[PDB]
Amino acid sequence: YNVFPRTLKWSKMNLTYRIVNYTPDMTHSEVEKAFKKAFKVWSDVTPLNFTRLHDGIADIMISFGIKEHGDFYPFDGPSGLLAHAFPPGPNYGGDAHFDDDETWTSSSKGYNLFLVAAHEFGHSLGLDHSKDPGALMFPIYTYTGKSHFMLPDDDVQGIQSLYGPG
Amino acid sequence: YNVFPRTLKWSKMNLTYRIVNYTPDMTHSEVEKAFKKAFKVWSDVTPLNFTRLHDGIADIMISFGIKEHGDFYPFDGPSGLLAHAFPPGPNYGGDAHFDDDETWTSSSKGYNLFLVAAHEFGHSLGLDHSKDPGALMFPIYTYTGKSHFMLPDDDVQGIQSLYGPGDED
Amino acid sequence: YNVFPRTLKWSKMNLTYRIVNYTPDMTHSEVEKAFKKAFKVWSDVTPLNFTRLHDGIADIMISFGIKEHGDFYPFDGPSGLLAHAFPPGPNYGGDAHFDDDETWTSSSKGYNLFLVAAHEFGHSLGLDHSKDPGALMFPIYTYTGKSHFMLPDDDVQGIQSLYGPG
Amino acid sequence: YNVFPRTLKWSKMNLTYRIVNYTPDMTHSEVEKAFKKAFKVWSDVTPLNFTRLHDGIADIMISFGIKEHGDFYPFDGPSGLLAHAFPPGPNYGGDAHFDDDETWTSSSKGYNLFLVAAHEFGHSLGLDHSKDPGALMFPIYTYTGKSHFMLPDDDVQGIQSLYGPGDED
Numbered sequence A, C: 001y002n003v004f005p006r007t008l009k010w011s012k013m014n015l016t017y018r019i020v021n022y023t024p025d026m027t028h029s030e031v032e033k034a035f036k037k038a039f040k041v042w043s044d045v046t047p048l049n050f051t052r053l054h055d056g057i058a059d060i061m062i063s064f065g066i067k068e069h070g071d072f073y074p075f076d077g078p079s080g081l082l083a084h085a086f087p088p089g090p091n092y093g094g095d096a097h098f099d100d101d102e103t104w105t106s107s108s109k110g111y112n113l114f115l116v117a118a119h120e121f122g123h124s125l126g127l128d129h130s131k132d133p134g135a136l137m138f139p140i141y142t143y144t145g146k147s148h149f150m151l152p153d154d155d156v157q158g159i160q161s162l163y164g165p166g
Numbered sequence B, D: 001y002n003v004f005p006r007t008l009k010w011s012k013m014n015l016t017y018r019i020v021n022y023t024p025d026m027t028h029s030e031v032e033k034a035f036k037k038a039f040k041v042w043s044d045v046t047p048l049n050f051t052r053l054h055d056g057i058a059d060i061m062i063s064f065g066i067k068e069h070g071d072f073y074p075f076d077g078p079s080g081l082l083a084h085a086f087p088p089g090p091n092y093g094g095d096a097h098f099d100d101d102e103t104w105t106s107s108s109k110g111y112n113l114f115l116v117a118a119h120e121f122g123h124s125l126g127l128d129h130s131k132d133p134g135a136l137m138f139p140i141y142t143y144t145g146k147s148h149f150m151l152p153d154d155d156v157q158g159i160q161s162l163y164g165p166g167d168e169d
């Protein structure tokens, strides 16, 4: 027999990402910074490193889309589903899509992109939803106003359980 | 925290299905009996339970379509791809699609719907194709009609590696 | 230059149809009768004839589907959009899809299939929406209880303006 | 009663568009200037009006995507198909898609976004490809950058056969 085995973790520590397109809501510079900072969340506590490619295929393809946007898991217009990502693996594995029917922001007016991305990249790297209500991997969006992100211990233990400490 | 599970499987034992639409080739009643039996192939041999829904969102959405019918697996007219099913997962996950350019039956003629459905529902549950030529999960159609259907050992081991044996008696 | 020319009418009077699949809500016999009767509406007042095929390609392919069902014009779950059809032409032209997230009926409990089909086949044959509130080609569903359908004069004039009288 | 119109065209002169997302290759501002100019190619020469929407449902939804991006017209990486647009109609009708595996510019380098958009928007409005090698609707990319853009006669005749000339002065 055969089952469908999942890829439980990336078998390499060095990963690439490509920002394929850009939301109307934020500057390219703001978007870029949000994603760089969201990857940093995970690289800061593991041996994982993240390199941005401008062209061609990277492990983690990032794009913004609305409704049916190419994977038959359509988004839903404003609110509800915010974004989704695929777990580790080839092709669509690791990739992240953000519903551009949301208003994305570098602060408080709409969804904070850094925080939603950081959550999504947890998925990209092998983490499911946490049941701990303080966790970044908890299913619900929270934005504290705080200018300095610290990754909650539950997420640190989760990611470390896959990759070890940095 | 939670890491994703080891294999694609359902994380709950109680599953629902919906017959979204029906083939011209057989009565509603024959289609329903075929699919009920196909699920029982798997429930008999694990702790899985299957309940039919008449409408709304079920885990396993069953439908009959031809050519482009809403995914990346277009059908191809008569013979060829008979049907396909998505592995366990949300939305399209677990769904089962049957090519209605085939002849579906409850006999030895055309393609026996019970047998192809039993096969497809292994995919819906987490089994890919087997290489064991006696396996129900073998990717080639073979008709048998034994009064008491026995699931081949290779399929019993595959499915129980995913969900365990359920009540062994 | 080129525009995209529409096919304004079928260039043949004899047309075929295929019922590809069947709703859960009605017997095959009931469904069959509804479609036969809905075609009859248009054949009764024009030289058009309709032949049912069981297999292969016919001019008017009839199927029931939910959500995304193969043409990127998805249905919408219960209520709202009931069905849609394509105007005359090859391939998808003439075809009719019915949203099987509606309850279809031979009477009053849910949508009367005969009446919605008859409307859809008006589209299949080259008619747009009527502005006359009594017309079968008016955009809004009405079901009178009446056991005997008579096609409103506005629709008779519309279809005849394309094909002539029977 | 109403028979369908003779050609695929918009049955209203006031049309809206939405820039759903943006290419990495150019600033928001450059992208907006390119598209505004592309629409003005057609509004200058018919009674058509185009208004930008910042969100929601517009007649013409513009977006940048790669490979499978939600239709039956997957992109193909660099060169090849540059972009495609649906003819006038509801939902996908009028929408314009640009392959972001191309290099989009506001110069002679890569593919000039203004020119490819001007071309695509003819499709969004009801023009198919022309055989006139000097036509904007010719299916092959050619760069010119004349300060005052003149729409070629073949494209003026095509578009006005659909919507008339608007104010001729």
Ligand SMILES: O=C(N[C@@H]1CCCS(=O)(=O)C1)c1ccc(Oc2ccc(C#C[C@]3(O)CN4CCC3CC4)cc2)cc1
Pocket: A079, A080, A081, A082, A083, A115, A116, A117, A119, A120, A133, A134, A135, A136, A137, A138, A139, A140, A141, A142, A143, A144, A152
């Ligand atoms: O789409 C989403 N949710 C649902 C999916 C199904 C459809 S639905 O249920 O409507 C929405 C979705 C929701 C949230 C999300 O990203 C998330 C998830 C959790 C957080 C968080 C948090 C914090 O408490 C706030 N700070 C202190 C502790 C911790 C970290 C920083 C932020 C973004 C990403 C996606």
Ligand SMILES: O=C(N[C@@H]1CCCS(=O)(=O)C1)c1ccc(Oc2ccc(C#C[C@]3(O)CN4CCC3CC4)cc2)cc1
Pocket: C079, C080, C081, C082, C083, C115, C116, C117, C119, C120, C133, C134, C135, C136, C137, C138, C139, C140, C141, C142, C143, C144, C152
């Ligand atoms: O889907 C539909 N409508 C909308 C489309 C956009 C989404 S929405 O606006 O929610 C619904 C739709 C609606 C209706 C429909 O079929 C129709 C349309 C009109 C009729 C009618 C009628 C009658 O008045 C009743 N009798 C006496 C005169 C005449 C004929 C017999 C019946 C079915 C077919 C499709």
Ligand SMILES: O=C(N[C@H]1CCCS(=O)(=O)C1)c1ccc(Oc2ccc(C#C[C@]3(O)CN4CCC3CC4)cc2)cc1
Pocket: B079, B080, B081, B082, B083, B084, B115, B116, B117, B119, B120, B133, B134, B135, B136, B137, B138, B139, B140, B141, B142, B143, B144, B152
């Ligand atoms: O679509 C199908 N396969 C290919 C078609 C060609 C195009 S493709 O090559 O992509 C896939 C397809 C789909 C479903 C199928 O269902 C199947 C698969 C296997 C069987 C079987 C069998 C037995 O040998 C007969 N009995 C004794 C032992 C076992 C069990 C009972 C029956 C139906 C079989 C084939």
Ligand SMILES: O=C(N[C@H]1CCCS(=O)(=O)C1)c1ccc(Oc2ccc(C#C[C@]3(O)CN4CCC3CC4)cc2)cc1
Pocket: D079, D080, D081, D082, D083, D084, D115, D116, D117, D119, D120, D133, D134, D135, D136, D137, D138, D139, D140, D141, D142, D143, D144, D152
């Ligand atoms: O995708 C495209 N075409 C093919 C690519 C190969 C795959 S395919 O063969 O399917 C289609 C494609 C898409 C958009 C294009 O935009 C176009 C099309 C034509 C032009 C032009 C031109 C001129 O000659 C230059 N100037 C003087 C006269 C005219 C007008 C101004 C510019 C952009 C051009 C090509």
Ligand SMILES: [Ca+2]
Pocket: A058, A059, A060, A061, A089, A090, A091, A092, A093, A094, A095
């Ligand atoms: Ca990937």
Ligand SMILES: [Ca+2]
Pocket: A075, A076, A077, A078, A079, A080, A081, A082, A099, A101, A102
């Ligand atoms: Ca949303």
Ligand SMILES: [Ca+2]
Pocket: B075, B076, B077, B078, B079, B080, B081, B082, B099, B101, B102
């Ligand atoms: Ca087939």
Ligand SMILES: [Ca+2]
Pocket: B058, B059, B060, B061, B089, B090, B091, B092, B093, B094, B095
């Ligand atoms: Ca499912």
Ligand SMILES: [Ca+2]
Pocket: C058, C059, C060, C061, C089, C090, C091, C092, C093, C094, C095
């Ligand atoms: Ca057809």
Ligand SMILES: [Ca+2]
Pocket: C075, C076, C077, C078, C079, C080, C081, C082, C099, C101, C102
């Ligand atoms: Ca509906």
Ligand SMILES: [Ca+2]
Pocket: D075, D076, D077, D078, D079, D080, D081, D082, D099, D101, D102
């Ligand atoms: Ca390309």
Ligand SMILES: [Ca+2]
Pocket: D058, D059, D060, D061, D089, D090, D091, D092, D093, D094, D095
């Ligand atoms: Ca549109």
Ligand code: NA
Pocket: A023, A024, A025, A099, A100, A101, A102, A103, A104
């Ligand atoms: Na947005």
Ligand code: NA
Pocket: B023, B024, B025, B099, B100, B101, B102, B103, B104
């Ligand atoms: Na069939």
Ligand code: NA
Pocket: C023, C024, C025, C099, C100, C101, C102, C103, C104
């Ligand atoms: Na139904």
Ligand code: NA
Pocket: D023, D024, D025, D099, D100, D101, D102, D103, D104
């Ligand atoms: Na690009």
